[PDB]
Swiss-Prot record:
UniProt keyword Transcription regulation present: no
Catalytic activity: ATP-dependent breakage, passage and rejoining of double-stranded DNA
Protein's GO biological process: chromosome organization; chromosome segregation; DNA topological change; plasmid partitioning; response to antibiotic; sister chromatid cohesion
Subunit structure: Heterotetramer composed of ParC and ParE.
Cofactor(s) recorded in Swiss-Prot or TrEMBL: Mg(2+); Mn(2+); Ca(2+)
Organism: Escherichia coli (strain K12)
Protein's UniProt name: DNA topoisomerase 4 subunit B
From-to range in the entire protein, with total length: 4 to 383 of 630
Keywords (A to Z) from UniProt: Antibiotic resistance, ATP-binding, DNA-binding, Isomerase, Magnesium, Metal-binding, Nucleotide-binding, Topoisomerase
Enzyme class: isomerase
Documented activity regulation: Pyrrolopyrimidines inhibit both GyrB and its paralog in topoisomerase IV (parE).
An annotated Gene Ontology molecular function: ATP binding
Length: 380
């Protein structure tokens, strides 16, 4: 039979435990770690947290500590439960559905930490607020320890600590990728100037710390250091408005070499790019086309295409949006339609102006793009 009883209604964290693939990267637990790290970074971005400490424990569990405002522990006026339980056990429950708690945040779904909870054998949360320390714990997504006061601390000492033990049953490998972890963490320090980021690995017995006042430029430069580039130092630019901002560092490696191509939205690494990256690409192409067309150095029958200025472009792109739109909980791609035009406009304007005031380096770049077009033409 196929009647009403055939329809099942999953509630709480059950959908995450039943369909893990839709909520996280099941390759390894690193992404679970990023959900937690992102939440701490959002506090730093809002200017509340000054540091985020991450610890990979010998038992392969992960602990993330921040000195932000701390997760709210008071009773929710409508749900009648401490905000903390709500945040940990309910999907689509969070403080980033508006811009009242954070102006620019990587979080927006009200799902992250609850996914960490659903896929962990155990989760311990500690909050420091009002000169008091609170504790609450879960196992397999279910609360096993009610919110309780575990002591006193300085009134000015506030923050959140999350320690979780991933359930190996949901991942290809239960081991945390160390290189991925440090790559993600260093980037946070680069993208949020002044915030101190630390990573203590107790499996391999190491400890690192990252804190950069400048950031972008050196990050790209060092990544390509020792490789011929054009121009000699990265082309950088930025624009900041109330609801949006864009920052970048880029250059080309025409003679070959490993390219660095990273894009971010509210410090969330968008590994699959998206509309913001499309904008950067289009802007660079529009400006180069203008330079070539005006200087009349474009051979008859030769038309530049995106590939001609993108193929060997190494770049780091960091965008801020009051209300981004990602294609999935993993946030690998930004699908926010208007961000393409936004980035494109800023980049084209900055690049054409830079080109016009750096004629020598510009002509070399132009030659690089044109020869690429002819190479591509002869190929077809
Ligand atoms: N370390 C923290 N400090 C202060 N508040 C926090 C912290 N972690 C979580 N919260 C809050 O709890 C809410 C729910 O977290 P979460 O379920 O991860 O949703 P999210 O922030 O929208 N992220 P995401 O689902 O990945 O887009 C957040 O929106 C914050 O209001
Ligand atoms: Mg939630």
């Amino acid at each position: 039979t196929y009647n009403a009883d055939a329809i099942e209604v999953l509630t709480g964290l059950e959908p995450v435990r039943r369909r893990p693939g839709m909520y996280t990267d099941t390759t390894r637990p690193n992404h679970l770690g990023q959900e937690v790290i992102d939440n701490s970074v959002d506090e730093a971005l809002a200017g509340h947290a000054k540091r985020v400490d991450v610890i990979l424990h010998a038992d392969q569990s992960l602990e993330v500590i921040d000195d932000g405002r701390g997760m709210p522990v008071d009773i929710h006026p409508e749900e009648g439960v401490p905000a903390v339980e709500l945040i940990l056990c309910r999907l689509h429950a969070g403080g980033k559905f508006s811009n009242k708690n954070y102006q620019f945040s990587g979080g927006l779904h009200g799902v992250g930490i609850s996914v960490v909870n659903a896929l962990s054998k155990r989760v311990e949360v500690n909050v420091r607020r009002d000169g008091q320390v609170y504790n609450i714990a879960f196992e397999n997504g279910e609360k096993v320890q009610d919110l309780q006061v575990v002591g006193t601390c300085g009134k000015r000492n506030t923050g959140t600590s999350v320690h979780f033990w991933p359930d190996e049953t949901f991942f290809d490998s239960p081991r945390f990728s160390v290189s991925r972890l440090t790559h993600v963490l260093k980037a946070k320090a680069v993208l949020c100037p002044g915030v101190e980021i630390t990573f203590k690995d107790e499996i391999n017995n190491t400890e690192q710390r990252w804190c950069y006042q400048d950031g972008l430029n050196d990050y790209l430069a060092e990544a390509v250091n020792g490789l011929p580039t054009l121009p000699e130092k990265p082309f950088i630019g930025n624009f900041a408005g109330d609801t949006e901002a864009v920052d970048w560092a880029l250059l080309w490696l025409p003679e070959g070499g490993e390219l660095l191509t990273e894009s971010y939205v509210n410090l969330i690494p968008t590994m699959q790019g998206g509309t913001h990256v499309n904008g950067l690409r289009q802007g660079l192409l529009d400006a180069m086309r203008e330079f070539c067309e005006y200087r009349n150095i474009l051979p008859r029958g030769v038309k530049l295409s995106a590939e001609d200025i993108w193929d060997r472009c190494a770049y780091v792109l960091s965008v801020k949006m009051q209300d981004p739109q990602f294609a999935g909980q993993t946030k690998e791609r930004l699908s926010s339609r208007q961000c393409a035009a936004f980035v494109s406009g800023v980049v084209k304007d900055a690049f054409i102006l830079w080109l016009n005031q750096n004629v020598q380096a510009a002509e070399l770049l132009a030659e690089m793009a044109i020869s690429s077009a002819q190479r591509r033409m002869r190929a077809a």
